[PDB]
Amino acid sequence: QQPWVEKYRPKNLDEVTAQDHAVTVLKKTLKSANLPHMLFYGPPGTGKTSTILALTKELYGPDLMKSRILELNASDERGISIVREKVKNFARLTVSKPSKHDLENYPCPPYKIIILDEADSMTADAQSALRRTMETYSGVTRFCLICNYVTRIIDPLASRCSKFRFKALDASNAIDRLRFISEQENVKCDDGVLERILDISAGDLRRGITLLQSASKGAQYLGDGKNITSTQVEELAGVVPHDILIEIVEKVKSGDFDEIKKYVNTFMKSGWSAASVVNQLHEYYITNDNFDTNFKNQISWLLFTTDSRLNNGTNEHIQLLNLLVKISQL
């Protein structure tokens, strides 16, 4: 049919989980018509698009939505000219008259909503043009900005738009949703499973749902009818096995450049991601009590520098080798 991420997308504002504050504000906005300009920001896969789509569904319904909603994302041109003509013309438009069915089954607010998804990719000039467009036509048009990086939104727009931070979906946040999805999809797992899934999927429910779907597909292919263990979850998540990490730590402990270089070459021959192994090394070194305070401070700074370098799309091999060499000389 459809992937579990799109199959279990929330339809109402009640299905959205762990984001209680924004959901409650939008629900009280349903009973009123003083909804302000919203700025949805947070980690990826936290449910901002799902929340805005659910609110849009509840406000107008399937019929008035096509006439009362304009959606622009990163897949379409959003230059200064586009903002100055299309957005301004849509905001200047008169609100469409609801039908009897719409006015009898939906609140039908006297405004319309312009949704600008992936607003972090918008240039500063477009936002500057957007400022007075939202301010002048606030009583006839509402604006929603969705992004992951708040700093990419200019200060005047962050001032005009109400800020709604979306919390990262940890284990306790989305364990109920994952359990509901597993029960509805008939997935059997051991105790502690789906918790390792939400731990690996740090602040992401989409990745956790995809991992659960992949584990279920693997179990169905096996056909043994056995519960999914945490070992399989870590394997298809890309988590380095603990034996390999232990060997990495042991070879780092002996500060030999040649042995470390050979083992790093063999390790990157296995295709392991540098980000995951760096996170695992960070967890191992910070968690372990065999190291003193100075070593922990230096290792934290080194891991921060390595993570920042890796996030810039650099070479995984060079960064991992340099990090391990620096650890061996600590």
Binding site: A18, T24, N34, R84, D125, D155, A168, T287, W301
Partner: protein, 327 residues
């Protein structure tokens, strides 16, 4: 239909006496109006300080009923290129007054987004037709304006809103909406406002939405922190105490527990720790440098994103290493 509006565009001042905070600027422009002479005004300040509201109320006060034809307002939403400045602005500030005498008012909202050629053409229009037309320039960044344009414009600085203006506006909003606010929540709201009225209005609207039943219910600091998702001062103090005094494992545990209790963001904790450490007395001057530099790169990396736990451990290690210089 003012009840169908966001609180930011619901309490926009209509008269000059409804604008709080900038008492000096309001008094100066009122004296200008009463004397009958108005120079080429230039309003500068951070967003939300009340420049557009002030100039709109001033124009309404000058032209009570002829605001439609005596005021030409252009902003970044409309094209303000060389051709628009050459034709439309000149045509407006080239004809005589209709019947109101006085002068014609041209407001250039967000003039920092205008091109340099447009400002170069505008300076001669400003200095040429000043007998019957006065220009007002609003901008948040003065570096994007031509120095000649700043030379021919009288500069007015809009300071961030002081405490008392925020208290008065919040009291007016509470009276209008029949809402209650605890003094602790009042202090929390002003601190997060950062001299911005729009932030205060948005947070107040979100807090009224947060309450299950708006009347008979007070808004406490817990409501503020739950609606806006900001760390409590007690949480920041506990995190700083754990980082500064406790060992590495328990400090990491405390940071993780504090962050997972309410879903707090690491950048908010970083800002809180920066604000608290500014009040600290450091006798080495190297701890200050280490703290500022390490926290700056950590904040920048958070802005670009990455591993969150690694960034938190980096914050803890940076604070510990910086405070190791105080020996």
């Amino acid at each position: 239909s003012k009840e169908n509006l966001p609180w930011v565009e619901k309490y926009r001042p209509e008269t000059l006496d409804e604008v709080y905070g900038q008492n000096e600027v309001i008094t100066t422009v009122r004296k200008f109006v009463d004397e009958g002479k108005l120079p080429h005004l230039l309003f500068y300040g951070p967003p939300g300080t009340g420049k557009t509201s002030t100039i709109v109320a001033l124009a309404r006060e000058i032209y009570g009923k002829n605001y439609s034809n005596m005021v030409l307002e252009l902003n970044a939403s409309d094209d303000r290129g060389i051709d628009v400045v050459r034709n439309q602005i000149k045509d407006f500030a080239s004809t005589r007054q209709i019947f109101s005498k006085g002068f014609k008012l041209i407001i250039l909202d967000e003039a920092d987004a205008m091109t340099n050629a447009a400002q170069n053409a505008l300076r001669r229009v400003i200095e040429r037709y000043t007998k019957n037309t006065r220009f007002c320039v609003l901008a948040n960044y003065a570096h994007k304006l031509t120095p000649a344009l700043l030379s021919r414009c009288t500069r007015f600085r809009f300071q961030p809103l002081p405490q008392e203006a925020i208290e008065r506006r919040i009291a007016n909003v509470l009276v209008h909406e029949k809402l209650k606010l605890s003094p602790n929540a009042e202090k929390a709201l002003i601190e997060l406002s950062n001299g911005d009225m729009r932030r205060v209005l948005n947070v107040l609207q979100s807090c009224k939405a947060t309450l299950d039943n708006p009347d008979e219910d007070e808004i406490s600091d817990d409501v503020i922190y739950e609606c806006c998702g900001a760390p409590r001062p007690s949480d920041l103090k506990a995190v700083l105490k754990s980082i500064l005094e406790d060992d590495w494992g328990t400090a990491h545990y405390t940071l993780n527990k504090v962050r997972s209790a309410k879903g707090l963001a690491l950048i908010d904790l970083i800002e809180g720790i920066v604000k608290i450490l500014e009040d600290y007395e450091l006798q080495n001057e190297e701890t200050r440098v280490h703290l500022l530099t390490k926290l700056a790169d950590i904040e920048y990396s958070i802005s670009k994103g990455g591993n969150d736990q690694i960034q938190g451990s980096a914050v803890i290690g940076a604070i510990k290493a910086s405070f190791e210089n105080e020996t």
